[model samples]
Target: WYFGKLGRKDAERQLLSFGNPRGTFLIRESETTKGAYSLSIRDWDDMKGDHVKHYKIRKLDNGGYYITTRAQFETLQQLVQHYSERAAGLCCRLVVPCHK
Candidate 1:
């Protein structure tokens, strides 16, 4: 579910190998943000084709985590759990983990 330091290009390649199934995702450290993380997920578009979408996992001042302002969790696990059950504001609900 988590791949530390995986580059953006590599993340896309890996997701593609998994058949680009929508909702398949992985978490990795953000390339541009020192202490932040990124959520990479496979998505499909009729016109644009299948692709990977990346979202910044932002940290709260209270040390919690959140992707969208509507939700926050005290731990990364909790955040993942919530999103897995419901996409909420994400591109889609996390269905499969991009195997390492």
Candidate 2:
């Protein structure tokens, strides 16, 4: 909520929030984030239920993406497509997942 999550942009990739970035947010990407939700409710559920876990993908601006465990509401987890989960045919650095 403080450093990365803000502004009036289109939210870049699907906007996901964890914990209460507005409240006592967890520091680590996966620990504090509560979960992800689309701007729309049904869209939110779709992401929740079926979106395949891109386990090793890393976000350059942030650190990593978060997905709820059991659709959890208070805990988040970090995901990185390291080693092999390359997006499209493009491959980033081995350290891309290491970015802060």
Candidate 3:
């Protein structure tokens, strides 16, 4: 569920090699911000082709987490679970966890 310190390129390579299946995703420490995290997921678009999308996860002052301001969670697990059930504002619903 977590891939600590994994860089963006490595994350994309892993997800693509795993078949670029839509909604496959992984969480990793943000490259641009220490202590922050990123959500990387594979998505297919007829116009853009198969690609990985990245979203920066923001931390609330209260120590909660959120990808968008509309929703927030006290833990990463809750955030993942919520997005897994519905894409909400994400590119797609999280379908599979990135393979090790």
Candidate 4:
């Protein structure tokens, strides 16, 4: 998502590796990735309209902050992709930004 917009190569591999949006779901559910991450989610959405969920061992790069839903693999692929991209976009925002 971010790569295609900012870094196309990575995004392509990710999108390709992800394979039809279901890869994201499988990885999240698979033991390899799933084994490490913990589950987190909220009943409703937040200001960004993103659902809340956390799946990490130590947490995300910055403060372990992540938004997800308990519905894993339940929500539409586009929605999950959006949320994942949204969080990735925050990689810079959480620490510094040009707008500010």
Candidate 5:
């Protein structure tokens, strides 16, 4: 909401928020490359269908940290390529407000 209102021009990554109904959010990139990232959705409690487990991700492919989508990407290039298409499709489908 705030990000939508303020907007981003010369945006850098590593957006962190604390104290939410769900938990904390961390939109961070890997130290190495654009392809590696962890969009952490942390939950405080053990709820069903929770995304991040105990502040860590489960469902490992042993290909680095795994996302719930249950696939593997050996390189950052592979990860970015996969998500790039998905993100485009998502925006077209839902038309999320002020999200790019």
Candidate 6:
């Protein structure tokens, strides 16, 4: 079964390879914000609506972080490909504008 967007709790249901960069549930730190850092995740890759393109590990209240989307693939290469594509979009969005 494809383990995609099921949450960290479901990670054990899926499989992972050696040296997988995804620390837990195919999610890794992507960037940082004012108070916390952001985690990059490949979410909702097959559907639409706020939909499963990616997710962020958010620092929420109660002094805890949250990640709603959990995506898993058959292989590390596949996982990397999916996340890199999604992360690439973020990279573009992060590009700083050149001032004249």
Model number with the top lDDT: 3
The digit string of per-residue lDDT tens for model 1 on 1-100 reads 4488888898888877754466778998998877788888877778756688888889988679888788788888898898889888777788888866
Model 1, CA-based lDDT: 0.81
Off by over 4 Å in 5: 1-36, 40-62, 88-100
lDDT of each: 0.81, 0.23, 0.84, 0.29, 0.33, 0.34
Which clashing pairs does model 3 show?
none
Q: What value does the lDDT take at residue 3 in candidate 5?
A: 29
lDDT of 2 by residue, 4-100 (tens): 3322122312323332121111112222224332111111233353121222222333433323222212222222222124222222211211112
Tens-place lDDT digits, model 6, residues 41-74: 3222224311112345455454445433354344
The best candidate in terms of TM-score: 3
Candidate 1 wrong stretches, greater than 4 Å: none
Report how far off residue 35 is in candidate 5 (Å): 15
Residue 77 displacement in candidate 6 (angstroms):
23
- Cα deviation at 40, candidate 2, in Å, is 14
Clashing residue pairs in candidate 6 (N, C-alpha, C atoms within 3 angstroms): 5-70, 43-52, 44-52
Candidate 6: 10-residue stretch with minimal lDDT:
91-100
Q: TM-score-based ranking, best first?
A: 3, 1, 5, 6, 4, 2
User: What clash pairs does model 1 have?
Assistant: none
TM-score for model 6? Answer: 0.25
What tens-digit string does per-residue lDDT give for candidate 4 at 1-100? 1111212232223323412322222113213343333222221234533232333322244343234433233223333455444444322111111110
Against the true structure, candidate 2 has what lDDT?
0.23
TM-score of each: 0.88, 0.18, 0.91, 0.19, 0.29, 0.25
Worst 10 residues of 1 by lDDT: 15-24
lDDT of 5 by residue, 3-99 (tens): 2221112112212122233333343443333334543333333444323321122223465554445555565345445543563322111111122
